[PDB]
């Protein structure tokens, strides 16, 4: 036969993956179905532009919430492609593609600045961005070695100091590989915004933690104790608005997570050249999901 055998290579775009919006909608459903606020205040506007605060009061039961691993499976008629290329930056064509019935097991965590309990890179650290040139595009950092962070809930979480320092070190190197070897890398704390954005915030065991992460993002070419506090009144992530959750059930609340990634932003401007500044980012949970689904692409079977 003259016919030739060929592997089927598809094009990927982790930035325009419908699996992300789908998961985002699923996470939101699972939450409202298990952790709803006692009072929810959300802005309600009309055409002209006049708005009024909407207040919703409902039962807000609290129960020990344990991580339920989930994954996405292909419905009859479609298949889930998986890019297995090394250092896959998340876009363009993939040479070594495979198929799976469902995605790997995921333990979805809502957080900002740091990605917790996610998947690690097999080779070295990899940084991905929809457009590095654009300083308005978030940079997702996928570590290849997790860093344990334990919160004794006693108002502070602890991390290895040299291990976190080694992490910034390797991350900075990867940034040089993407912006220039002679450029100087510098990490600075958030420039501001809501507390969830300014601090490293995450939900653990159904509680909303806010940790001061200044000691973590102050660097330039033992343990690290971060001051953290639990809040009942916060800003929602599922939608714009404020909410109030019930006080903690258990007496002492602890939390042990693996730092598998980070969300950064680079300071733009043509000012002060030769150096790049990166601060902790995040806020749009879609990027949190995207950090786990970047290697998948659902395509119609044919």
């Amino acid at each position, epitope marked *: 036969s003259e016919v030739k055998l060929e592997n089927v290579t598809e094009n990927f775009n982790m930035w325009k993956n419908n699996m992300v919006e789908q998961m985002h909608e699923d996470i939101i459903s699972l939450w409202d179905q298990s952790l709803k606020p006692c009072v929810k205040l959300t802005p309600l506007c009309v055409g002209a532009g006049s708005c009024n605060t909407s207040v919703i*009061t409902q*039962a807000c039961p609290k129960v020990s919430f344990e991580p339920i691993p989930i994954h996405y499976c292909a419905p009859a008629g479609f298949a889930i492609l998986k890019c297995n290329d090394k250092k896959f930056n998340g876009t363009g064509p993939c040479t070594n593609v495979s198929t799976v019935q469902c995605t790997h097991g995921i333990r979805p965590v809502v957080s900002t600045q740091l990605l917790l309990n996610g998947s690690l890179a097999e080779e070295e650290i990899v940084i991905r961005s929809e457009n590095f040139t654009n300083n308005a595009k978030t940079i997702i950092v996928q570590l290849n070695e997790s860093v344990v962070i334990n919160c004794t809930g006693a108002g502070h979480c602890n991390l290895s100091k040299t291990q976190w320092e080694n992490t910034l070190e390797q991350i900075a190197i990867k940034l040089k590989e993407q912006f220039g070897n002679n450029k100087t890398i510098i990490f600075n704390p958030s420039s501001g915004g809501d507390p969830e954005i300014v601090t490293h915030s995450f939900n653990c065991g159904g509680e909303f933690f806010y940790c001061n992460s200044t000691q973590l993002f102050t660097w330039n070419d033992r343990n690290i104790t971060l001051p953290c506090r639990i*809040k009942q*009144i916060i800003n929602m992530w599922q939608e714009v608005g404020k909410a*109030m959750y019930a006080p903690p059930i258990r007496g002492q609340i602890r939390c042990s997570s693996n730092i598998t990634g980070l969300l950064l932003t680079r300071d733009g401007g043509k000012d002060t050249n030769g150096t790049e500044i990166f601060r902790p980012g995040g806020g749009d949970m879609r990027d949190n999901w995207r950090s786990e689904l970047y290697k998948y692409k659902v395509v119609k079977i044919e």
Partner: antibody, heavy 128, light 110 residues
Framework: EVQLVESGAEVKKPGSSVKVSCKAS????????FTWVRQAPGQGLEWMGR????????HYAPHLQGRVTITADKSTSTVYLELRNLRSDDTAVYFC?????????????????????WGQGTLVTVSS | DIVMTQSPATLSVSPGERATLSCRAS??????LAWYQQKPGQAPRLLIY???TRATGVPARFSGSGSGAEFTLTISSLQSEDFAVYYC???????????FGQGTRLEIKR
């Protein structure tokens, strides 16, 4: 040092409306939630409603049918109870009360439903 | 919705003696139960909260116990200042619909 002072006795005619004030002093206002309790002559206490100051959200007792509104003025650190279309059986002493909720300004809130501090009460007589 | 019933309506006891008041909820209210004391012509004073926690400034002879739908307020040694009306209050439901008991008048037995 945390005290609650209510405005003086009032006499109203049926169909009129009355607004009772409750001045709070002694601590960070936004860190307390306030409740209004009424007591008709010779009867027991009745929970009317409670306002979560920092959030500026008030919850009410059922059978009030929007004839009552509880508001707070952060500026004067004052709580108000507005009762409309007054009936003679609205006659009673209205009590203003509150409790500490924690560092609400820092996002912490206990949402305690009991009443530690109480105002002296305001007699409201509705009669033609 | 949640009815609090106090009993007896009137309790007569000799001074220096011990009195035990009873309050019952039409359904579990957990420990969100408080007790208050009120003298004629005066504002109510908070005695116990959290079903068993005694508020600051409240004499040591006052104590509360119970949980769920059964609570009791104990006054080990009645003093002249303790004869008045006592009310219980639940604040466990949400959306909040807090309710008081109709009270128990404690009078001196002679």
């Amino acid at each position: 040092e945390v005290q609650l002072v209510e405005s003086g006795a009032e006499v109203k005619k049926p169909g009129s409306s009355v607004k009772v004030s409750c001045k709070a002093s002694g601590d960070t206002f936004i860190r307390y939630s306030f409740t209004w309790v009424r007591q008709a002559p010779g009867q027991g206490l009745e929970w009317m409603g409670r306002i979560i100051t920092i959030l500026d959200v008030a919850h009410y007792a059922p059978h009030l049918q929007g004839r009552v509104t509880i508001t707070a003025d952060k500026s004067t650190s004052t709580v108000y109870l507005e009762l409309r279309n007054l009936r003679s059986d609205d006659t009673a002493v209205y009590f203003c009360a509150g409790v500490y909720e924690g560092e609400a300004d820092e996002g912490e809130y206990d949402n305690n439903g009991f009443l530690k501090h109480w105002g002296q009460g305001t007699l409201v007589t509705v009669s033609s | 919705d949640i009815v609090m019933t106090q009993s007896p309506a009137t309790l007569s006891v000799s001074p220096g003696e011990r009195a035990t008041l009873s309050c019952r909820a039409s359904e579990s209210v957990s420990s969100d139960l408080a007790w208050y004391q009120q003298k004629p012509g005066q504002a109510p004073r908070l005695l116990i909260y959290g079903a068993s926690t005694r508020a600051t400034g409240v004499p040591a002879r006052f104590s509360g116990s119970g949980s769920g739908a059964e609570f009791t307020l104990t006054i080990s040694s009645l003093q002249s200042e303790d004869f008045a009306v006592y009310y219980c209050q639940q604040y466990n439901n949400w959306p909040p619909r807090y309710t008081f008991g109709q009270g128990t008048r404690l009078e001196i037995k002679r």
